[PDB]
mmCIF file of C-alpha atoms in Angstrom:
data_model
loop_
_atom_site.group_PDB
_atom_site.id
_atom_site.type_symbol
_atom_site.label_atom_id
_atom_site.label_comp_id
_atom_site.label_asym_id
_atom_site.label_seq_id
_atom_site.Cartn_x
_atom_site.Cartn_y
_atom_site.Cartn_z
ATOM 1 C CA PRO A 3 3.374 -2.987 -21.351
ATOM 2 C CA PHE A 4 3.201 -0.027 -18.952
ATOM 3 C CA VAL A 5 3.392 3.594 -20.122
ATOM 4 C CA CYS A 6 3.981 6.327 -17.551
ATOM 5 C CA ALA A 7 1.540 9.169 -18.214
ATOM 6 C CA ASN A 8 1.752 12.757 -16.965
ATOM 7 C CA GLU A 9 -1.435 13.721 -15.127
ATOM 8 C CA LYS A 10 -0.994 17.392 -16.064
ATOM 9 C CA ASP A 11 -1.510 16.376 -19.709
ATOM 10 C CA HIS A 12 -5.063 15.282 -18.799
ATOM 11 C CA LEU A 13 -6.480 18.107 -16.666
ATOM 12 C CA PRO A 14 -9.594 19.975 -17.854
ATOM 13 C CA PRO A 15 -9.410 23.784 -17.947
ATOM 14 C CA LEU A 16 -9.958 25.729 -14.731
ATOM 15 C CA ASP A 17 -12.225 28.774 -14.721
ATOM 16 C CA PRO A 18 -10.292 31.840 -13.469
ATOM 17 C CA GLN A 19 -13.072 33.002 -11.144
ATOM 18 C CA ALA A 20 -13.716 29.471 -9.868
ATOM 19 C CA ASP A 21 -9.999 29.011 -9.208
ATOM 20 C CA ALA A 22 -9.902 32.210 -7.147
ATOM 21 C CA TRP A 23 -12.779 30.868 -5.042
ATOM 22 C CA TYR A 24 -11.200 27.409 -4.769
ATOM 23 C CA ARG A 25 -7.890 28.851 -3.567
ATOM 24 C CA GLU A 26 -9.552 31.063 -0.955
ATOM 25 C CA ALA A 27 -11.698 28.208 0.377
ATOM 26 C CA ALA A 28 -8.696 25.867 0.464
ATOM 27 C CA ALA A 29 -6.714 28.501 2.364
ATOM 28 C CA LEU A 30 -9.524 29.072 4.880
ATOM 29 C CA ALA A 31 -9.601 25.326 5.615
ATOM 30 C CA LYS A 32 -5.817 25.136 6.097
ATOM 31 C CA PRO A 33 -4.992 26.666 9.520
ATOM 32 C CA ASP A 34 -5.340 24.560 12.662
ATOM 33 C CA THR A 35 -7.707 27.013 14.335
ATOM 34 C CA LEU A 36 -11.444 27.666 14.319
ATOM 35 C CA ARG A 37 -12.543 27.544 10.692
ATOM 36 C CA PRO A 38 -15.755 28.852 8.905
ATOM 37 C CA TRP A 39 -16.792 25.510 7.446
ATOM 38 C CA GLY A 40 -20.273 26.618 6.386
ATOM 39 C CA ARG A 41 -18.708 29.402 4.348
ATOM 40 C CA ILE A 42 -15.933 27.123 3.058
ATOM 41 C CA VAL A 43 -18.631 24.726 1.831
ATOM 42 C CA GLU A 44 -20.484 27.587 0.130
ATOM 43 C CA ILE A 45 -17.368 28.913 -1.624
ATOM 44 C CA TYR A 46 -16.421 25.421 -2.836
ATOM 45 C CA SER A 47 -19.989 25.062 -4.134
ATOM 46 C CA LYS A 48 -19.793 28.292 -6.149
ATOM 47 C CA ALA A 49 -16.541 27.064 -7.701
ATOM 48 C CA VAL A 50 -18.084 23.649 -8.426
ATOM 49 C CA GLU A 51 -20.846 25.518 -10.277
ATOM 50 C CA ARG A 52 -18.204 26.881 -12.663
ATOM 51 C CA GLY A 53 -16.706 23.426 -13.225
ATOM 52 C CA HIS A 54 -13.655 23.529 -10.939
ATOM 53 C CA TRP A 55 -12.487 19.926 -10.566
ATOM 54 C CA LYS A 56 -10.394 20.555 -7.445
ATOM 55 C CA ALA A 57 -13.333 22.215 -5.682
ATOM 56 C CA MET A 58 -15.363 19.091 -6.470
ATOM 57 C CA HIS A 59 -12.706 16.907 -4.836
ATOM 58 C CA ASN A 60 -12.302 18.985 -1.668
ATOM 59 C CA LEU A 61 -16.044 19.523 -1.204
ATOM 60 C CA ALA A 62 -16.816 15.833 -1.741
ATOM 61 C CA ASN A 63 -14.244 14.850 0.884
ATOM 62 C CA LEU A 64 -16.001 17.196 3.326
ATOM 63 C CA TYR A 65 -19.404 15.687 2.517
ATOM 64 C CA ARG A 66 -18.342 12.069 3.225
ATOM 65 C CA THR A 67 -15.654 12.738 5.823
ATOM 66 C CA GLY A 68 -17.589 15.304 7.815
ATOM 67 C CA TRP A 69 -16.111 17.626 10.404
ATOM 68 C CA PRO A 70 -17.293 17.888 14.058
ATOM 69 C CA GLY A 71 -19.340 21.084 14.202
ATOM 70 C CA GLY A 72 -18.796 22.402 10.691
ATOM 71 C CA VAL A 73 -20.179 19.815 8.266
ATOM 72 C CA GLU A 74 -22.259 17.393 8.166
ATOM 73 C CA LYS A 75 -21.557 13.960 6.601
ATOM 74 C CA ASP A 76 -23.569 13.022 3.502
ATOM 75 C CA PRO A 77 -22.089 10.270 1.301
ATOM 76 C CA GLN A 78 -24.568 10.668 -1.564
ATOM 77 C CA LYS A 79 -23.546 14.258 -2.328
ATOM 78 C CA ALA A 80 -19.855 13.326 -2.220
ATOM 79 C CA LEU A 81 -20.591 10.659 -4.835
ATOM 80 C CA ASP A 82 -22.585 13.076 -7.006
ATOM 81 C CA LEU A 83 -19.492 15.296 -7.072
ATOM 82 C CA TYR A 84 -17.293 12.320 -7.971
ATOM 83 C CA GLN A 85 -19.701 11.673 -10.847
ATOM 84 C CA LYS A 86 -19.333 15.278 -12.028
ATOM 85 C CA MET A 87 -15.553 14.788 -12.037
ATOM 86 C CA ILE A 88 -15.486 11.621 -14.146
ATOM 87 C CA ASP A 89 -18.019 13.181 -16.524
ATOM 88 C CA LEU A 90 -15.289 15.776 -17.135
ATOM 89 C CA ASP A 91 -12.726 12.938 -17.478
ATOM 90 C CA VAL A 92 -10.852 14.162 -14.391
ATOM 91 C CA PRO A 93 -8.142 11.616 -13.461
ATOM 92 C CA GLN A 94 -8.609 12.221 -9.725
ATOM 93 C CA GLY A 95 -12.338 11.610 -10.167
ATOM 94 C CA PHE A 96 -11.766 8.020 -11.264
ATOM 95 C CA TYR A 97 -9.558 7.420 -8.222
ATOM 96 C CA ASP A 98 -12.098 9.089 -5.928
ATOM 97 C CA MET A 99 -15.010 7.032 -7.260
ATOM 98 C CA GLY A 100 -13.057 3.784 -7.001
ATOM 99 C CA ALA A 101 -11.927 4.562 -3.458
ATOM 100 C CA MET A 102 -15.601 4.917 -2.485
ATOM 101 C CA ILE A 103 -17.352 2.112 -4.414
ATOM 102 C CA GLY A 104 -14.486 -0.263 -5.214
ATOM 103 C CA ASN A 105 -11.965 -0.624 -8.029
ATOM 104 C CA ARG A 106 -13.605 -3.314 -10.168
ATOM 105 C CA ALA A 107 -16.832 -1.283 -10.300
ATOM 106 C CA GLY A 108 -15.115 0.801 -12.987
ATOM 107 C CA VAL A 109 -15.329 -1.851 -15.716
ATOM 108 C CA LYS A 110 -19.052 -1.223 -16.235
ATOM 109 C CA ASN A 111 -18.805 2.578 -16.001
ATOM 110 C CA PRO A 112 -19.197 4.361 -19.375
ATOM 111 C CA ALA A 113 -16.496 6.920 -18.508
ATOM 112 C CA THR A 114 -13.702 4.350 -18.022
ATOM 113 C CA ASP A 115 -13.858 2.727 -21.497
ATOM 114 C CA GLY A 116 -14.036 -0.689 -19.820
ATOM 115 C CA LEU A 117 -11.197 -0.237 -17.312
ATOM 116 C CA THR A 118 -11.328 -0.400 -13.547
ATOM 117 C CA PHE A 119 -11.379 2.956 -11.769
ATOM 118 C CA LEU A 120 -7.717 2.686 -10.743
ATOM 119 C CA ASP A 121 -6.658 1.537 -14.223
ATOM 120 C CA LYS A 122 -8.483 4.420 -15.906
ATOM 121 C CA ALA A 123 -7.063 6.939 -13.431
ATOM 122 C CA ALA A 124 -3.525 5.551 -13.665
ATOM 123 C CA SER A 125 -3.710 5.494 -17.471
ATOM 124 C CA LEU A 126 -4.314 9.255 -17.273
ATOM 125 C CA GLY A 127 -1.284 9.564 -14.986
ATOM 126 C CA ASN A 128 -3.123 9.993 -11.673
ATOM 127 C CA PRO A 129 -0.410 9.730 -8.969
ATOM 128 C CA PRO A 130 -2.723 8.407 -6.215
ATOM 129 C CA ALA A 131 -3.934 5.666 -8.566
ATOM 130 C CA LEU A 132 -0.399 4.860 -9.739
ATOM 131 C CA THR A 133 0.769 4.605 -6.123
ATOM 132 C CA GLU A 134 -1.981 2.230 -4.975
ATOM 133 C CA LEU A 135 -1.580 0.009 -8.045
ATOM 134 C CA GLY A 136 2.174 -0.012 -7.465
ATOM 135 C CA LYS A 137 1.663 -1.274 -3.916
ATOM 136 C CA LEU A 138 -0.804 -3.903 -5.145
ATOM 137 C CA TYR A 139 1.577 -5.279 -7.785
ATOM 138 C CA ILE A 140 4.577 -5.229 -5.431
ATOM 139 C CA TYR A 141 3.086 -6.660 -2.249
ATOM 140 C CA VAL A 142 0.022 -8.667 -3.388
ATOM 141 C CA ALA A 143 0.739 -9.801 -6.963
ATOM 142 C CA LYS A 144 4.533 -10.169 -6.480
ATOM 143 C CA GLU A 145 5.204 -8.171 -9.662
ATOM 144 C CA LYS A 146 8.156 -6.178 -8.347
ATOM 145 C CA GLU A 147 9.356 -4.668 -11.631
ATOM 146 C CA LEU A 148 5.892 -3.562 -12.768
ATOM 147 C CA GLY A 149 4.887 -2.313 -9.320
ATOM 148 C CA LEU A 150 8.070 -0.270 -8.961
ATOM 149 C CA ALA A 151 7.425 1.253 -12.393
ATOM 150 C CA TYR A 152 3.976 2.413 -11.257
ATOM 151 C CA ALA A 153 5.330 3.962 -8.050
ATOM 152 C CA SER A 154 8.264 5.592 -9.855
ATOM 153 C CA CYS A 155 5.866 7.178 -12.354
ATOM 154 C CA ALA A 156 3.898 8.797 -9.530
ATOM 155 C CA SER A 157 7.129 9.692 -7.710
ATOM 156 C CA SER A 158 8.645 11.421 -10.753
ATOM 157 C CA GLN A 159 5.500 13.578 -11.004
ATOM 158 C CA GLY A 160 6.229 15.086 -7.581
ATOM 159 C CA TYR A 161 3.857 12.909 -5.524
ATOM 160 C CA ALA A 162 5.298 12.624 -2.017
ATOM 161 C CA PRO A 163 3.385 9.478 -0.885
ATOM 162 C CA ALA A 164 4.831 7.571 -3.850
ATOM 163 C CA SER A 165 8.396 8.605 -2.998
ATOM 164 C CA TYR A 166 7.757 7.627 0.623
ATOM 165 C CA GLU A 167 6.426 4.224 -0.467
ATOM 166 C CA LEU A 168 9.512 3.613 -2.610
ATOM 167 C CA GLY A 169 11.724 4.528 0.342
ATOM 168 C CA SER A 170 9.751 2.209 2.612
ATOM 169 C CA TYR A 171 10.150 -0.555 0.023
ATOM 170 C CA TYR A 172 13.936 -0.264 -0.128
ATOM 171 C CA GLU A 173 14.262 -0.111 3.668
ATOM 172 C CA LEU A 174 12.057 -3.081 4.567
ATOM 173 C CA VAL A 175 12.204 -5.344 1.494
ATOM 174 C CA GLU A 176 15.669 -4.790 0.010
ATOM 175 C CA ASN A 177 17.408 -3.417 3.143
ATOM 176 C CA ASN A 178 19.099 -0.787 0.952
ATOM 177 C CA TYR A 179 19.079 2.014 3.519
ATOM 178 C CA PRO A 180 20.908 4.738 1.518
ATOM 179 C CA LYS A 181 18.440 4.184 -1.320
ATOM 180 C CA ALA A 182 15.598 4.365 1.208
ATOM 181 C CA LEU A 183 16.969 7.604 2.667
ATOM 182 C CA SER A 184 17.272 9.200 -0.776
ATOM 183 C CA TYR A 185 13.621 8.493 -1.604
ATOM 184 C CA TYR A 186 12.574 9.780 1.828
ATOM 185 C CA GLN A 187 14.418 13.049 1.163
ATOM 186 C CA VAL A 188 12.778 13.321 -2.262
ATOM 187 C CA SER A 189 9.420 12.806 -0.545
ATOM 188 C CA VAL A 190 10.257 15.634 1.877
ATOM 189 C CA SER A 191 11.011 17.974 -1.035
ATOM 190 C CA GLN A 192 7.584 17.033 -2.438
ATOM 191 C CA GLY A 193 5.801 17.996 0.784
ATOM 192 C CA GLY A 194 5.992 14.574 2.423
ATOM 193 C CA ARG A 195 4.917 14.906 6.048
ATOM 194 C CA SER A 196 5.660 11.285 6.969
ATOM 195 C CA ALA A 197 9.035 11.265 5.206
ATOM 196 C CA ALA A 198 10.213 14.406 7.013
ATOM 197 C CA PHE A 199 9.051 12.967 10.339
ATOM 198 C CA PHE A 200 10.833 9.642 9.850
ATOM 199 C CA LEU A 201 13.920 11.159 8.216
ATOM 200 C CA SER A 202 14.241 13.207 11.410
ATOM 201 C CA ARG A 203 13.987 10.053 13.540
ATOM 202 C CA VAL A 204 16.774 8.427 11.495
ATOM 203 C CA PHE A 205 19.298 10.895 12.939
ATOM 204 C CA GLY A 206 17.893 11.233 16.467
ATOM 205 C CA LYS A 207 19.991 10.199 19.457
ATOM 206 C CA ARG A 208 17.233 8.149 21.094
ATOM 207 C CA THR A 209 15.976 6.342 17.986
ATOM 208 C CA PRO A 210 16.533 2.564 18.193
ATOM 209 C CA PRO A 211 19.261 1.641 15.686
ATOM 210 C CA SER A 212 17.010 -0.538 13.506
ATOM 211 C CA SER A 213 14.509 2.294 12.969
ATOM 212 C CA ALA A 214 17.456 4.614 12.320
ATOM 213 C CA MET A 215 18.659 2.044 9.738
ATOM 214 C CA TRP A 216 21.954 2.029 11.680
ATOM 215 C CA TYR A 217 22.910 5.553 10.663
ATOM 216 C CA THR A 218 25.098 7.565 12.994
ATOM 217 C CA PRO A 219 22.965 10.063 14.958
ATOM 218 C CA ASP A 220 23.373 13.672 13.831
ATOM 219 C CA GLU A 221 21.699 16.242 16.070
ATOM 220 C CA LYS A 222 21.712 18.942 13.380
ATOM 221 C CA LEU A 223 20.009 16.716 10.788
ATOM 222 C CA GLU A 224 17.453 15.610 13.390
ATOM 223 C CA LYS A 225 16.487 19.251 13.950
ATOM 224 C CA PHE A 226 16.689 20.236 10.269
ATOM 225 C CA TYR A 227 14.233 17.574 9.118
ATOM 226 C CA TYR A 228 11.956 17.919 12.143
ATOM 227 C CA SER A 229 11.718 21.610 11.239
ATOM 228 C CA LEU A 230 10.577 20.708 7.718
ATOM 229 C CA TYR A 231 8.040 18.279 9.199
ATOM 230 C CA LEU A 232 6.467 21.102 11.216
ATOM 231 C CA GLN A 233 6.402 23.424 8.191
ATOM 232 C CA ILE A 234 4.762 20.745 6.038
ATOM 233 C CA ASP A 235 2.351 19.931 8.877
ATOM 234 C CA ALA A 236 1.210 23.568 8.956
ATOM 235 C CA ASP A 237 1.206 24.011 5.149
ATOM 236 C CA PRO A 238 0.767 20.802 3.105
ATOM 237 C CA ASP A 239 1.163 22.807 -0.132
ATOM 238 C CA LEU A 240 4.751 23.713 0.770
ATOM 239 C CA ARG A 241 7.469 22.366 -1.525
ATOM 240 C CA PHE A 242 11.275 22.456 -1.337
ATOM 241 C CA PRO A 243 12.501 22.039 -4.934
ATOM 242 C CA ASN A 244 16.148 22.740 -3.962
ATOM 243 C CA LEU A 245 16.312 20.477 -0.891
ATOM 244 C CA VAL A 246 17.947 17.462 -2.545
ATOM 245 C CA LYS A 247 20.523 19.284 -4.663
ATOM 246 C CA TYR A 248 21.904 21.534 -1.886
ATOM 247 C CA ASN A 249 21.504 19.202 1.131
ATOM 248 C CA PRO A 250 23.217 15.917 0.229
ATOM 249 C CA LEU A 251 22.555 13.203 2.782
ATOM 250 C CA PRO A 252 25.441 11.607 4.686
ATOM 251 C CA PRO A 253 26.533 8.149 3.531
ATOM 252 C CA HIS A 254 25.536 5.080 5.469
ATOM 253 C CA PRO A 255 28.419 3.959 7.729
ATOM 254 C CA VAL A 256 28.482 0.539 6.020
ATOM 255 C CA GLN A 257 26.315 0.705 2.885
ATOM 256 C CA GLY A 258 27.571 4.102 1.672
ATOM 257 C CA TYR A 259 25.280 5.667 -0.937
ATOM 258 C CA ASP A 260 23.928 2.387 -2.384
ATOM 259 C CA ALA A 261 23.901 -1.005 -0.649
ATOM 260 C CA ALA A 262 24.451 -2.617 -4.057
ATOM 261 C CA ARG A 263 27.561 -0.449 -4.593
ATOM 262 C CA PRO A 264 28.650 0.444 -1.049
ATOM 263 C CA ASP A 265 31.941 2.075 -2.119
ATOM 264 C CA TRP A 266 30.715 4.712 -4.595
#
């Protein structure tokens, strides 16, 4: 049996000073201009000293995925930070470690209680882990019902890539385009860059009909959702918690609001 967990129920405390440093360093790394990476690294490091689990994640990603002139690529330090995270039982830490050394390596790790890294992370409600496992059950193991449950758990926690993956599932596998559109719009409200980009294409004049899912082009929706794409592209922390309720999507010309029930 699968139990959907809430990741926020399993987050260690965040030091108030370390969180101030983390937020400033994350902001400095945000704009698409010249950025002070050496100083961003140093600020993240000071926050890591005080136990900030998000500073550990961001700094580790910089150490393994370097950055042209700023920093500096070093996989071993990124992994030492991942170790610090799982020692604190951070759900993202289990996902991060598994993404770097493989899922099944978790079974032997003392911090996972015998689970794989994805299983341990997903059991603590980690949305990235729930999303990957959902894709694996759906597309590799052919466990549709279980895989959809994993993705829906991550989606209901506000994780935009999970909502986008559910929308992509209903478009390509079930050909339920109104259901796909609704998940894409949910993903946009959750800061989904890809969903906003492709939701905009759905209503563009020049989009081939199959990629538009045979919706009628709507120039105002094309511009509305391309505008959200640009906002999310500039600020990935942006959310739109009122987007769905006050901007109902148009029905599909044939499938309505649900291909299963095209006349609702």
